Ligand SMILES: O=C(O)[C@@H]1O[C@@H](O)[C@H](OS(=O)(=O)O)[C@@H](O)[C@@H]1O[C@H]1O[C@H](COS(=O)(=O)O)[C@@H](O)[C@H](O)[C@H]1NS(=O)(=O)O
Ligand SMILES: OC[C@H]1O[C@@H](O)[C@H](O)[C@@H](O)[C@@H]1O
Ligand SMILES: OC[C@H]1O[C@@H](O)[C@H](O)[C@@H](O)[C@@H]1O
Ligand SMILES: OC[C@H]1O[C@@H](O)[C@H](O)[C@@H](O)[C@@H]1O
Ligand SMILES: OC[C@H]1O[C@@H](O)[C@H](O)[C@@H](O)[C@@H]1O
Ligand SMILES: OC[C@H]1O[C@@H](O)[C@H](O)[C@@H](O)[C@@H]1O
Ligand SMILES: OC[C@H]1O[C@@H](O)[C@H](O)[C@@H](O)[C@@H]1O
Ligand SMILES: OC[C@H]1O[C@@H](O)[C@H](O)[C@@H](O)[C@@H]1O
Ligand SMILES: OC[C@H]1O[C@@H](O)[C@H](O)[C@@H](O)[C@@H]1O
Ligand SMILES: OC[C@H]1O[C@@H](O)[C@H](O)[C@@H](O)[C@@H]1O
Ligand SMILES: OC[C@H]1O[C@H](O)[C@H](O)[C@@H](O)[C@@H]1O
């Protein structure tokens with residue numbers, strides 16, 4: 158399973174301005190609803206975490222492909 | 227150097243007293259976070275959200291800085 | 294792990310292409326920065342701001358991601 | 361004492377005041393940054409962005425500079 | 428870990444003759460904002476010497492420092 162104890166929560170306060178190349182994407186996560194602002198956190202193959210605006214539609218297809226695979 | 231990176235925000239503090247002997251480092255959460263918080267790091271690299279308004283925490287923060 | 298920490302921004306870009314053999318890592322600058330930028334880290338631990346519009350810059354980033 | 365190195369900018373200041381004896385050093389941010397900023401260095405080498413307008417920030421800088 | 432409001436290092440004159448490589452301790456390339464592109468070699472005597480980045484030996488010294 159997955160343990161979720163007293164542990165910091167990953168929240169986004171600033172999204173990327175430029176669309177990440179999909180072939181750089183390795184995985185995705187979504188910020189907890191407790192966060193003040195929404196956000197999607199893409200994990201690049203270089204293991205970098207990038208905040209992305211979920212309202213923007215390029216991040217939404219990226220999630221679709223990741224899930225539907 | 228990292229950019230557009232998520233910000234660590236505590237939403238649940240630990241109620242107990244942490245053995246200071248286990249503490250290795252500390253980080254106070256961002257002001258952008260909805261609530262204040264301090265993240266202690268243990269020697270097993272385990273991040274723990276702690277309440278800054280509580281007082282065993284600032285003592286740990288003080289001793290970590292004043293050193 | 295940090296909070297209320299400064300952000301790396303590029304206000305000028307290198308005029309010469311860095312030999313790829315020197316490249317250790319890369320970091321794209323924050324969207325909050327006034328200008329676009331890529332920060333290449335060399336093996337001598339030099340931090341160089343590069344123009345993301347240059348094709349050699351885009352290639353280096355691609356190679357680092359696909360490795 | 362510079363190069364085409366990235367620049368330290370502040371986009372988020374700390375809300376509450378830092379205890380003074382935590383501060384080890386300071387330096388203002390470049391004017392090229394979209395926002396003004398004062399970066400306090402703690403005794404644990406941790407960098408904190410501070411609002412130059414705030415009363416305590418100006419006082420901390422004053423004390424550091426008169427030593 | 429980044430720069431502030433200070434004076435950027437610029438080279439307005441390079442060096443005609445080649446520094447003995449075993450004198451070189453480190454190197455820094457000047458900003459592109461400068462008029463002339465330059466390389467600053469730091470000697471073991473902690474001295475700073477400007478150098479033409481397009482010269483044969485300068486590129487070699489930088490290469491040897493990086494690949495170490
Ligand atoms: O030599 C080549 O053909 C390689 O691809 C070229 O496109 C690169 O030119 S660059 O874009 O114009 O400046 C060359 O630098 C490159 O030589 C490389 O060798 C390896 C492998 O390349 S990578 O794409 O396959 O993985 C690597 O160390 C560098 O990518 C590059 N190093 S080099 O020796 O400095 O040129
Ligand atoms: O305050 C530091 C800031 O750094 C930026 O690079 C991030 O995108 C923000 O999420 C963060 O708040
Ligand atoms: O993290 C576990 C620790 O909890 C503390 O409350 C106890 O006093 C310690 O004995 C124990 O090691
Ligand atoms: O297409 C989007 C582009 O964004 C830039 O910021 C990156 O440096 C490129 O690698 C990428 O191709
Ligand atoms: O802000 C004033 C500072 O003065 C320095 O000389 C001291 O070393 C610090 O302990 C103090 O915080
Ligand atoms: O600092 C001494 C330097 O001497 C040079 O000749 C070497 O190439 C470097 O690896 C070394 O760092
Ligand atoms: O001497 C060689 C150098 O001369 C300078 O005036 C130019 O700006 C550079 O492009 C050139 O590399
Ligand atoms: O001005 C003459 C010099 O120009 C430099 O840019 C070249 O690297 C040298 O080879 C040449 O001797
Ligand atoms: O010592 C290294 C040598 O490398 C050669 O490629 C250069 O032409 C010489 O100027 C230099 O002295
Ligand atoms: O040493 C200088 C040489 O380094 C090599 O890695 C590349 O071919 C160029 O950057 C240059 O010709
Ligand atoms: O590519 C990175 C982007 O983010 C930066 O904020 C720039 O304002 C924008 O022009 C650039 O395209």
Ligand SMILES: [Cl-]
Nearest residue numbers: 192193259260
């Ligand atoms: Cl929040």
Ligand SMILES: [Cl-]
Nearest residue numbers: 326327393394
């Ligand atoms: Cl800016």
